[PDB]
Amino acid sequence: ILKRLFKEGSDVKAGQQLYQIDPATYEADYQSAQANLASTQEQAQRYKLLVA
Amino acid sequence: ADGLAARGTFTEQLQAQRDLVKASDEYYQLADKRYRTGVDNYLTLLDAQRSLF
């Protein structure tokens, strides 16, 4: 845990950020999947142009 | 008689040859569209251009 972003004894709201568990491997495999999207979306758009 | 045979067969041969040229021209145009969109490289475009030539 890197941070605690809520004041104790406060009216918390649905969708508020409480902690921050350290994103390192999650940012890593997020970029590893974002690279696949950045290639295969180009593939989909090129073939969508060429089907016409 | 050989001249008449040439008149009789070269219309069929030349129409088949113009259809050959139309098919190869449309193949080159599709390879050019495939290159301009970006899927294949320029070497395959030059190969289609040599086939049309």
PDB file of C-alpha atoms in Angstrom:
ATOM      1  CA  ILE A   1       0.000   0.000   0.000  1.00  0.00           C
ATOM      2  CA  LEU A   2       1.430   3.348  -1.118  1.00  0.00           C
ATOM      3  CA  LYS A   3      -1.266   5.785   0.093  1.00  0.00           C
ATOM      4  CA  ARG A   4      -4.406   6.037   2.209  1.00  0.00           C
ATOM      5  CA  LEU A   5      -6.699   8.593   0.592  1.00  0.00           C
ATOM      6  CA  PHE A   6      -9.671   8.714   2.976  1.00  0.00           C
ATOM      7  CA  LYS A   7     -10.024  10.658   6.204  1.00  0.00           C
ATOM      8  CA  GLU A   8     -11.028   8.310   9.014  1.00  0.00           C
ATOM      9  CA  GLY A   9     -14.562   8.763  10.279  1.00  0.00           C
ATOM     10  CA  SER A  10     -15.860  10.456   7.135  1.00  0.00           C
ATOM     11  CA  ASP A  11     -18.956   9.953   5.008  1.00  0.00           C
ATOM     12  CA  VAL A  12     -17.387   7.949   2.189  1.00  0.00           C
ATOM     13  CA  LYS A  13     -19.094   7.833  -1.207  1.00  0.00           C
ATOM     14  CA  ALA A  14     -19.695   4.954  -3.628  1.00  0.00           C
ATOM     15  CA  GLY A  15     -16.819   5.168  -6.092  1.00  0.00           C
ATOM     16  CA  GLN A  16     -14.249   6.974  -3.933  1.00  0.00           C
ATOM     17  CA  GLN A  17     -10.589   5.937  -3.970  1.00  0.00           C
ATOM     18  CA  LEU A  18      -9.532   4.652  -0.526  1.00  0.00           C
ATOM     19  CA  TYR A  19      -6.034   3.137  -0.798  1.00  0.00           C
ATOM     20  CA  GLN A  20      -3.384   2.776  -3.495  1.00  0.00           C
ATOM     21  CA  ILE A  21      -1.975  -0.747  -3.728  1.00  0.00           C
ATOM     22  CA  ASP A  22       1.257  -0.292  -5.748  1.00  0.00           C
ATOM     23  CA  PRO A  23       0.632  -0.749  -9.491  1.00  0.00           C
ATOM     24  CA  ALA A  24       3.811  -2.153 -11.012  1.00  0.00           C
ATOM     25  CA  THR A  25       3.003  -5.533 -12.563  1.00  0.00           C
ATOM     26  CA  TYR A  26      -0.489  -4.235 -13.346  1.00  0.00           C
ATOM     27  CA  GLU A  27       0.878  -1.270 -15.290  1.00  0.00           C
ATOM     28  CA  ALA A  28       3.312  -3.763 -16.873  1.00  0.00           C
ATOM     29  CA  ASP A  29       0.714  -6.170 -18.234  1.00  0.00           C
ATOM     30  CA  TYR A  30      -1.625  -3.262 -19.025  1.00  0.00           C
ATOM     31  CA  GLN A  31       1.038  -1.961 -21.415  1.00  0.00           C
ATOM     32  CA  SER A  32       1.623  -5.520 -22.653  1.00  0.00           C
ATOM     33  CA  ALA A  33      -2.066  -5.785 -23.609  1.00  0.00           C
ATOM     34  CA  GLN A  34      -2.254  -2.201 -24.918  1.00  0.00           C
ATOM     35  CA  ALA A  35       0.470  -3.061 -27.449  1.00  0.00           C
ATOM     36  CA  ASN A  36      -1.668  -5.921 -28.805  1.00  0.00           C
ATOM     37  CA  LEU A  37      -4.621  -3.558 -29.096  1.00  0.00           C
ATOM     38  CA  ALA A  38      -2.476  -0.965 -30.891  1.00  0.00           C
ATOM     39  CA  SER A  39      -1.467  -3.554 -33.496  1.00  0.00           C
ATOM     40  CA  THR A  40      -4.719  -5.438 -33.992  1.00  0.00           C
ATOM     41  CA  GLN A  41      -6.887  -2.307 -34.188  1.00  0.00           C
ATOM     42  CA  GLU A  42      -4.700  -1.220 -37.112  1.00  0.00           C
ATOM     43  CA  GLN A  43      -5.313  -4.665 -38.645  1.00  0.00           C
ATOM     44  CA  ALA A  44      -9.083  -4.298 -38.204  1.00  0.00           C
ATOM     45  CA  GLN A  45      -9.204  -0.794 -39.694  1.00  0.00           C
ATOM     46  CA  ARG A  46      -7.010  -1.715 -42.699  1.00  0.00           C
ATOM     47  CA  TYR A  47      -9.145  -4.726 -43.547  1.00  0.00           C
ATOM     48  CA  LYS A  48     -12.371  -2.763 -42.987  1.00  0.00           C
ATOM     49  CA  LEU A  49     -11.148  -0.296 -45.606  1.00  0.00           C
ATOM     50  CA  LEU A  50     -10.106  -3.065 -47.993  1.00  0.00           C
ATOM     51  CA  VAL A  51     -13.345  -5.114 -47.886  1.00  0.00           C
ATOM     52  CA  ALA A  52     -15.240  -2.362 -49.782  1.00  0.00           C
TER      53      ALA A  52
ATOM     54  CA  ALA B   1      -7.482 -19.118 -97.232  1.00  0.00           C
ATOM     55  CA  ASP B   2      -4.749 -18.540 -94.635  1.00  0.00           C
ATOM     56  CA  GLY B   3      -5.717 -14.858 -94.557  1.00  0.00           C
ATOM     57  CA  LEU B   4      -9.363 -15.809 -94.005  1.00  0.00           C
ATOM     58  CA  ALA B   5      -8.354 -18.191 -91.193  1.00  0.00           C
ATOM     59  CA  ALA B   6      -6.354 -15.385 -89.587  1.00  0.00           C
ATOM     60  CA  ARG B   7      -9.367 -13.051 -89.859  1.00  0.00           C
ATOM     61  CA  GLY B   8     -11.555 -15.730 -88.290  1.00  0.00           C
ATOM     62  CA  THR B   9      -9.313 -16.592 -85.349  1.00  0.00           C
ATOM     63  CA  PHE B  10      -7.558 -13.351 -84.398  1.00  0.00           C
ATOM     64  CA  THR B  11     -10.803 -11.682 -83.301  1.00  0.00           C
ATOM     65  CA  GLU B  12     -11.303 -14.463 -80.733  1.00  0.00           C
ATOM     66  CA  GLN B  13      -7.608 -14.449 -79.787  1.00  0.00           C
ATOM     67  CA  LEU B  14      -7.416 -10.670 -79.457  1.00  0.00           C
ATOM     68  CA  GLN B  15     -10.635 -10.489 -77.417  1.00  0.00           C
ATOM     69  CA  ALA B  16      -9.252 -13.153 -75.069  1.00  0.00           C
ATOM     70  CA  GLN B  17      -6.042 -11.112 -74.926  1.00  0.00           C
ATOM     71  CA  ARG B  18      -7.902  -7.888 -74.079  1.00  0.00           C
ATOM     72  CA  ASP B  19      -9.717  -9.780 -71.321  1.00  0.00           C
ATOM     73  CA  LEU B  20      -6.299 -10.987 -70.118  1.00  0.00           C
ATOM     74  CA  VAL B  21      -5.149  -7.371 -70.005  1.00  0.00           C
ATOM     75  CA  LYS B  22      -8.326  -6.214 -68.225  1.00  0.00           C
ATOM     76  CA  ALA B  23      -7.901  -8.934 -65.581  1.00  0.00           C
ATOM     77  CA  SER B  24      -4.242  -8.070 -65.007  1.00  0.00           C
ATOM     78  CA  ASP B  25      -5.031  -4.330 -64.858  1.00  0.00           C
ATOM     79  CA  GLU B  26      -7.723  -4.913 -62.237  1.00  0.00           C
ATOM     80  CA  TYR B  27      -5.301  -7.117 -60.278  1.00  0.00           C
ATOM     81  CA  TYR B  28      -2.718  -4.316 -60.335  1.00  0.00           C
ATOM     82  CA  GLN B  29      -5.349  -1.804 -59.224  1.00  0.00           C
ATOM     83  CA  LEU B  30      -6.309  -4.007 -56.269  1.00  0.00           C
ATOM     84  CA  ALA B  31      -2.643  -4.470 -55.344  1.00  0.00           C
ATOM     85  CA  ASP B  32      -2.255  -0.678 -55.493  1.00  0.00           C
ATOM     86  CA  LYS B  33      -5.262  -0.230 -53.193  1.00  0.00           C
ATOM     87  CA  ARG B  34      -3.804  -2.842 -50.821  1.00  0.00           C
ATOM     88  CA  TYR B  35      -0.496  -0.934 -50.805  1.00  0.00           C
ATOM     89  CA  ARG B  36      -2.030   2.542 -50.393  1.00  0.00           C
ATOM     90  CA  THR B  37      -4.105   1.418 -47.411  1.00  0.00           C
ATOM     91  CA  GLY B  38      -0.923  -0.095 -46.020  1.00  0.00           C
ATOM     92  CA  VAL B  39      -1.186  -3.873 -45.739  1.00  0.00           C
ATOM     93  CA  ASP B  40       1.431  -5.032 -48.234  1.00  0.00           C
ATOM     94  CA  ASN B  41       4.766  -3.411 -49.042  1.00  0.00           C
ATOM     95  CA  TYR B  42       6.053  -1.890 -52.284  1.00  0.00           C
ATOM     96  CA  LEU B  43       7.802  -5.025 -53.602  1.00  0.00           C
ATOM     97  CA  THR B  44       4.495  -6.828 -54.201  1.00  0.00           C
ATOM     98  CA  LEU B  45       3.210  -3.711 -55.961  1.00  0.00           C
ATOM     99  CA  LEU B  46       6.235  -3.793 -58.275  1.00  0.00           C
ATOM    100  CA  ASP B  47       5.617  -7.505 -58.924  1.00  0.00           C
ATOM    101  CA  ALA B  48       1.994  -6.781 -59.913  1.00  0.00           C
ATOM    102  CA  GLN B  49       3.238  -3.937 -62.122  1.00  0.00           C
ATOM    103  CA  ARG B  50       5.659  -6.276 -63.921  1.00  0.00           C
ATOM    104  CA  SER B  51       2.857  -8.806 -64.465  1.00  0.00           C
ATOM    105  CA  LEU B  52       0.729  -6.059 -66.042  1.00  0.00           C
ATOM    106  CA  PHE B  53       3.676  -5.062 -68.253  1.00  0.00           C
TER     107      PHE B  53
END
